[PDB]
Design a protein around this ligand. Sequence first.
Ligand SMILES: *[C@@H](C(=O)O)[C@H](O)C(=O)N[C@@H](CC(C)C)C(=O)NCCCCNC(N)=[NH2+]
Length: 212
Amino acid sequence: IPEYVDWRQKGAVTPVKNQGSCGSCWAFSAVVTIEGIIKIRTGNLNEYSEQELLDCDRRSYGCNGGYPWSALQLVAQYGIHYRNTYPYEGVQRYCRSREKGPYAAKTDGVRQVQPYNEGALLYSIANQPVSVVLEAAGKDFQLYRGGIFVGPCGNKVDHAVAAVGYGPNYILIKNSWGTGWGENGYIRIKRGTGNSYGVCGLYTSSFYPVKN
Ligand SMILES: *[C@@H](C(=O)O)[C@H](O)C(=O)N[C@@H](CC(C)C)C(=O)NCCCCNC(N)=[NH2+]
């Protein structure tokens, strides 16, 4: 795999979103990976609905948090609508998938990256955007403005994001806190430290969609 990957440069990443106060990061994270794999497999970049996963993933807890793997399983089992059809409201409401016509996109499964393994994660990122988790509660992460982030931070993961690239010393992350946070919405997180958890626990739990 190459020394640099940046899925934005291949036109496979949509604009940075803001989840607001709702604990919907798990849905935003999943949608980044759907938008990516559909561009990779079909040539077309579209925005898909975080709100639909928020409302409809019965294994998750709405704005009280959720699971990227369950959200991804939902898209593989049923499908997902365009963001325009099912726009983001920042609050969990009833599942309205049935009321909104046929699904826009569908995937074929979900796989997990072997946890606590930097190289396995890089291998997956070289193939597509990956849903990853990290510890975001620390004030160093909250106040991040730019550069390759080394912490301080622990490994108590609490925030789902999307890895959309990497370089020799970092993994490139699309956050869902708006374009004014970090590097226009992104953070580069230090890698290669020898810590099996990853910086801020970045290697704890990583999933990606499969599409034939
Ligand atoms: C993340 C966010 O929006 O910043 C959000 O709090 C979240 O989804 N957290 C997850 C953990 C990450 C995926 C690591 C979470 O806490 N999931 C478990 C669901 C919440 C616990 N149970 C109940 N009933 N609320």
